[PDB]
Design a protein around this ligand. Structure first.
Ligand SMILES: *[C@@H]1O[C@H](CO)[C@@H](O[C@@H]2O[C@H](CO)[C@@H](O[C@H]3O[C@H](CO)[C@@H](O)[C@H](O)[C@@H]3O)[C@H](O)[C@H]2NC(C)=O)[C@H](O)[C@H]1NC(C)=O
Length: 238
């Protein structure tokens, strides 16, 4: 996150850290057993046994008193996810219940975030959070989680020829300052864009041109657009 701030412990208790191989992504816990992220993150289609999800984590790849480490049962990328257009950039993970029957154990550090209903949030208080780059082409991802306030943007305004033009396709959503300076960056993807009335996951950190460049707001998967997709993909192993 560029132009952001170190967050308090538990500031974003719905953020998920995804680790596999020599790879990393973020995600958003939407229910005790369910995590939402970007499709591009898991492009490489790792076997689900290879994934580790860490909940309630303050620092990238650090153990912590309230950290929770779960396996993954199964997961699904959106069938139509395009790595040309970046359209339909989301994926849904079903976590693995521990030997008692529980997935995420709710705590002050580990908490799902409601989905929207898309009935729709012009210029509310919206925060983005992540462990990604603190500036474009930084050398390492952040250690402590970062947060930034970032305003929603109209499609009209975002699709303007000198902003993002016709790159912005249905299922996408812009959020950022046209003047630049604050934004998501590489390493923030899968992670939450959250807005308030009530706290709801409006966006999934997806793509962008640079990080917080003038007339280049971050693009996000429009969660509300995919509510049906999400419902109909809640099948799981037993
Ligand atoms: C930091 O990133 C690491 C990836 O580089 C990640 O390593 C993973 O950690 C878990 C242990 O929690 C391992 O899981 C399995 O290990 C043995 C079986 O061999 C079992 O006893 C365990 O129950 C479990 O099934 C993963 O194998 C390991 N993955 C890799 C790729 O090495 C860490 O979890 C990350 N740590 C934090 C705190 O974020």
């Amino acid at each position: 996150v560029v132009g952001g701030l170190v967050a308090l412990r538990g500031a974003h208790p719905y953020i998920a850290a995804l680790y596999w191989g020599h790879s990393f992504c973020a995600g958003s816990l939407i229910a005790p057993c369910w995590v939402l992220t970007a499709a591009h993150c898991l492009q490489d289609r790792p076997a689900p046994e290879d994934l580790t999800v860490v909940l309630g984590q303050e620092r990238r790849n650090h153990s912590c008193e309230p950290c929770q480490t779960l396996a993954v049962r199964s997961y699904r990328l959106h069938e139509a996810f395009s790595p040309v257009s970046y359209q339909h950039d989301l994926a849904l993970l079903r976590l693995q219940e521990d030997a008692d029957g529980s997935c995420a154990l709710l705590s002050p550090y580990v908490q799902p975030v409601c989905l929207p209903s898309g009935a729709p949030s012009e210029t509310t208080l919206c925060q983005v959070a992540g462990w990604g780059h603190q500036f474009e082409g930084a050398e390492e991802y952040a250690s402590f989680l970062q947060e930034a306030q970032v305003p929603f943007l109209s499609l009209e305004r975002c699709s303007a020829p000198d902003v993002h033009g016709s790159s912005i396709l249905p299922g996408m959503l812009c959020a950022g300052f046209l003047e630049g300076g604050t934004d998501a960056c590489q390493g923030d993807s899968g992670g939450p864009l959250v807005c308030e009335d009530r706290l709801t996951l409006q966006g999934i950190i997806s793509w962008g041109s640079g990080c917080g460049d003038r007339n280049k707001p971050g693009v996000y998967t429009d969660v509300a657009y995919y509510l049906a997709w999400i419902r109909e993909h809640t099948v799981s192993t037993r």
